Amino acid sequence: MTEIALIGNPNSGKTSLFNLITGHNQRVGNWPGVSVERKSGLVKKNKDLEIQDLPGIYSMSPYSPEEKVARDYLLSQRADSILNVVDATNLERNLYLTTQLIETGIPVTIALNMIDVKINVDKLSYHLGVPVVATSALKQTGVDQVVKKAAHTTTSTVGDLAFPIYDDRLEAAISQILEVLGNSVPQRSARFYAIKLFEQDSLVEAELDLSQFQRKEIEDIIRITEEIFTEDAESIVINERYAFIERVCQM
């Protein structure tokens, strides 16, 4: 069975789209160890697809349990695909999460929502390297198509993946964290873990069993990259994401 993770910003009509895809059969439980709601449901028109609703989140930071829930699920690789619900009226701000979702290594399909409620869909698709489909609940179009696209854009079907490329200086840091990580992380999510370690993410630092050597190399890399920017590590990433998004939205 194909498991499509539904994730987006709050107020993107994500919970609206979930209900319109799954119909009446909705199974709700609880995530392990936390009080965070676990919503799920099979696709109304295709019962062979289970849609896993994730809570509406703006980022994948170590500060929120909802954001931890979303992250941990995507790194456990229980999801085949990501169906990223994106509010078109606030494209730049919604794409902050998207860039992070793409880095996890689970193929992303974007349901570009609230088209009715101008963007060239194909150019946005091309510069993010992900399938994008305009979805309008009002016109009742592309909802079935975007599900189908996510359904066959999975960890199984897709070979290589396009990740957002940042400044050469940060890419230098990322590849040097990638070299020192070795096989301590999966190839699929390696880049995701490398950026989090650069940011000095509490969850990732504590999650990975890293040798004294690896931890010391990551430090040197952070120290030098912080000096060349004259900016703290976390901020460097934040600015890079927005810069990439602005470059992408220009298109």
Q: Check: CATH 1.10.287.1770 for 166-251?
A: yes
DSSP letter string over 186-233? -TTTHHHHHHHHHTT-HHHHHHS---HHHHHHHHHHHHHHHHHHTS-H
Other C-beta atoms closer than 10 Å to the C-beta of 96 total 17
Largest interatomic CA distance in the chain: 57
Q: Backbone phi, then psi, for 80, in 5-degree steps?
A: -80, -40
- 104 burial type by CB count under 10 A (0-12 exposed, 13-18 middle, 19+ buried): buried
Q: Are 57 and 65 in contact (CB under 8 A)?
A: no
Tokens encoding 67 = 């954001």
With both helix axes pointing from N to C terminus, report the angle between 212-229 and 233-250 in degrees, rounded to the nearest 10: 60
In sequence order, the β-bridge partners of residue 108 are 82
Sheet containing 132-135: order of strands: 26-30, 37-42, 49-53, 2-8, 81-87, 108-113, 132-135
Note the CATH architecture for domain 1-165. Answer: 3-Layer(aba) Sandwich (3.40)
CA 176, distance to chain mean position in Å, is: 23
Distance, CA of 241 to CA of 72 (rounded, Å): 21
DSSP letter string over 52-92? EE----S---TT-HHHHHHHHHHHTT--SEEEEEEEGGGHH
Distance, CA of 131 to CA of 128 (rounded, Å): 9
Give the experimental resolution in Å.
2.7
62: left (phi over 0), alpha (psi -120 to 50) or beta: alpha
Q: Backbone phi, then psi, for 225, in 5-degree steps?
A: -70, -35
Domain boundaries, the chain: 1-165, 166-251
Rounding to the nearest 10 degrees, give the CA dihedral for residues 201, 202, 207, 212: 90
Place of tokens 């709700």: 28
Q: Are 11 and 87 in contact (CB under 8 A)?
A: yes
Q: Is 49 helix (H, G, I), strand (E, B) or coil?
A: strand
Q: Which residues contact residue 100 at a Cβ distance below 8 angstroms, ignoring those fewer than 6 apart?
A: 59, 60, 192, 241
Does the CA dihedral 121-190-147-18 come out positive or negative?
Answer: negative
